[PDB]
Structures are given as C-alpha cells and as structure tokens.
Amino acid sequence: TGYVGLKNQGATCYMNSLLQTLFFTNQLRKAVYMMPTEGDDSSKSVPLALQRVFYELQHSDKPVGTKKLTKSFGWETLDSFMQHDVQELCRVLLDNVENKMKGTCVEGTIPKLFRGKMVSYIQCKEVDYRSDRREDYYDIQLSIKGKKNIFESFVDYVAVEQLDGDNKYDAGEHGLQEAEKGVKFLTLPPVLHLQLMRAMIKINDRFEFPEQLPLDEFLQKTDPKDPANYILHAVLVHSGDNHGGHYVVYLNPKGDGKWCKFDDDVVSRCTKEEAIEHNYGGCTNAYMLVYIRESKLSEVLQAVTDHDIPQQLVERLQEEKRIEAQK
Numbered sequence: 001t002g003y004v005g006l007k008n009q010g011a012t013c014y015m016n017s018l019l020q021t022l023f024f025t026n027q028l029r030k031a032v033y034m035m036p037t038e039g040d041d042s043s044k045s046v047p048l049a050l051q052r053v054f055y056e057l058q059h060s061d062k063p064v065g066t067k068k069l070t071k072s073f074g075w076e077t078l079d080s081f082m083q084h085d086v087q088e089l090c091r092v093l094l095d096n097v098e099n100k101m102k103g104t105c106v107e108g109t110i111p112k113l114f115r116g117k118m119v120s121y122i123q124c125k126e127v128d129y130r131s132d133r134r135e136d137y138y139d140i141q142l143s144i145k146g147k148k149n150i151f152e153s154f155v156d157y158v159a160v161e162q163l164d165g166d167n168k169y170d171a172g173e174h175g176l177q178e179a180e181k182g183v184k185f186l187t188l189p190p191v192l193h194l195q196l197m198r199a200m201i202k203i204n205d206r207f208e209f210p211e212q213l214p215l216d217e218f219l220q221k222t223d224p225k226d227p228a229n230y231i232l233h234a235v236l237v238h239s240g241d242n243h244g245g246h247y248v249v250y251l252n253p254k255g256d257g258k259w260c261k262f263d264d265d266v267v268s269r270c271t272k273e274e275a276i277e278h279n280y281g282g283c284t285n286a287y288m289l290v291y292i293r294e295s296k297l298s299e300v301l302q303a304v305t306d307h308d309i310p311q312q313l314v315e316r317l318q319e320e321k322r323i324e325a326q327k
C-alpha cells in the first residue's frame with residue numbers, strides 16, 4: 001500500500017477512521033500544514049496536533065499515535081467518544097482549523113471543501129404566507145430505516161411533510177394553519193459527508209449505496225457544465241454493540257477505485273466488494289460515507305510532496321520527536 005496506520009491507544013472508536021478520511025482529503029492536508037503553529041502551545045493547540053498526526057501519517061515507518069490530539073481537544077472521560085456522533089468530532093477539528101486559517105492565504109478552505117447550502121421552507125396551503133430560511137451545512141444525516149438505498153434517503157430528506165390537525169402551523173397573524181414544510185438543496189460541497197442514522201441501539205438493516213452517486217435532480221437549479229455526480233471516497237464502518245464495537249475505514253485515496261482497508265495500525269489492499277456491498281449490512285456495516293464531486297476530484301485529491309510542508313514546521317516536530325528520548 002505504502003500508507004501507514006494510526007495507533008489504537010484507548011477507545012477513540014471512530015476517531016482513527018475519521019482521521020484517515022481527512023488525511024486523504026488532500027487539499028485539506030496541504031491547507032492544514034500551512035496553518036501557523038510557529039508560536040502555538042505544543043500541548044493544547046489542536047491545529048498543531050492535526051499537523052503532527054498528518055506529518056507522521058505521511059512520514060512514519062511506524063503506526064502513528066494520537067494521544068496528543070485527544071488531549072489537545074480533551075475528550076478524556078470513560079465515555080467521551082461513545083457519547084458523541086461522528087460529525088460532532090469532525091466539526092471540532094474542522095473548527096479549530098478553519099479559525100487558525102483566518103487572515104491567511106489558506107483562509108476559506110474548510111468551507112470551500114465541506115460547506116454547501118440549503119433552504120428550509122414552510123408554505124401555507126390556503127392562505128398567502130411563506131417562511132424561507134437558508135442554512136449552511138457541512139454534513140448530512142440520512143434516515144435509513146425503511147430506506148433500501150441512498151436514493152430513497154435523499155428523497156425522504158426532501159419530502160414535503162404535511163402539518164394538519166393536532167400539529168397545524170402557528171402562522172401568527174393568520175392563526176393556526178395547514179401548511180407543508182420541507183427542505184431543498186441549492187448546492188452540494190466538493191466534499192459530501194454523509195452519516196447514516198443507525199443509532200436509535202444500532203440498526204443493522206441493509207442499506208445500499210453506490211460508487212457513483214448522481215445528485216443533480218435533488219438540486220433546484222442544475223448546472224449543465226457542472227453536474228453533481230459523486231465518487232465514493234471513503235466508507236466508515238463499525239461492527240458490534242454496546243459490549244464490543246470496532247471501527248474501520250475503507251478508502252480509495254486516489255479516486256481510482258483501488259480500495260484499501262484501514263484497521264488502525266494494519267492497512268491492507270482490499271476489493272471494491274469488501275469496501276462497498278460487504279458493508280451494506282443485513283454486524284458489520286457503513287455508518288458514514290465520503291463522496292467527492294467528480295469535477296473537483298483531481299484538485300481535492302491533488303498529490304502532496306514533502307516539499308508542501310514548511311521547514312519551520314518540519315524542524316519543530318523533529319526536535320519534538322528526537323527529544324522523545326526515554327531511559
């Protein structure tokens with residue numbers, strides 16, 4: 001493979017999976033590396049540790065440890081990983097970073113990759129009154145129960161729900177009213193992060209998902225020049241229950257369909273089938289997926305030299321490692 005794993009140090013559960021996912025979001029890696037940790041707290045600055053882990057992921061001939069990162073953002077209780085959803089952790093990281101990049105050349109990168117926009121609306125049936133509010137999303141949580149595939153999800157997601165009888169809409173000046181509330185995508189980000197709502201006690205129901213995911217039709221306008229076809233990039237996987245769970249991520253880091261299994265420290269080549277159909281579920285199955293828009297693929301997954309790291313940085317981390325000298 002050439003790729004190196006991450007250490008299992010405690011119960012980070014999904015963290016390692018998420019870390020790889022992100023570390024192979026190449027345009028974000030370059031961006032992270034650029035972040036100025038020149039005068040940062042070596043111990044408690046998250047943005048620093050995300051440089052360290054990525055550095056070591058790109059250079060370590062041994063499996064990369066994460067203790068310092070888990071410290072930097074301070075999920076150090078007996079349940080602090082299993083009490084949170086995965087996008088929550090993503091947001092933690094992607095926040096700390098997106099900030100540190102403000103007033104830099106690399107400002108605006110996290111949203112440029114992971115942010116898309118939306119409209120939630122409420123429209124009265126009989127009377128004239130509409131409520132349209134736009135929001136930004138960085139990630140999307142699909143309902144799987146009763147859904148066989150990703151399509152049915154995105155159609156469930158844009159389902160124009162009805163508000164009648166015991167739950168009519170307080171239209172204010174118009175009083176309680178019958179109206180329909182839905183959602184509608186305006187855009188979708190280069191990087192499309194999806195979580196499948198398996199927590200409820202874990203649902204293990206079969207939920208199919210494609211390698212190629214056309215999304216133009218859930219948009220309101222489409223783009224002839226830029227269609228919204230997506231390339232499955234990673235598949236975050238879990239298997240077990242409230243007693244024994246275990247986390248694994250499958251990636252094809254180059255968008256070429258050459259898949260790899262990442263079981264923490266152990267990384268191996270695997271089949272398309274192992275990554276995809278074998279994680280449809282029906283107990284060991286996908287809980288989050290990552291998808292790059294086809295057009296932006298080459299950029300997002302731009303390759304990364306060792307000359308894309310500043311020396312200043314490079315030097316600090318090494319001293320820090322060397323000085324890791326124990327008796």
Ligand SMILES: Cn1ccc2c(=O)n(CC3(O)CCN(C(=O)[C@@H]4CCN(Cc5ccc(-c6cncnc6)s5)C[C@H]4c4ccccc4)CC3)cnc21
Pocket residue numbers: 013014078079081082083084085086087141195196197198199200202203238241242243245287288
């Ligand atoms: C809003 N919503 C609804 C569902 C859902 C979701 O599944 N996700 C994905 C998820 O965030 C679920 C939680 N999660 C976990 O890893 C779970 C954390 C819960 N874990 C079970 C437990 C083990 C130990 C537990 C425990 C509880 N109390 C004290 N000590 C240990 S609870 C089982 C894990 C699980 C993994 C894959 C799918 C579904 C769940 C990350 C993946 C994100 N958002 C969601």
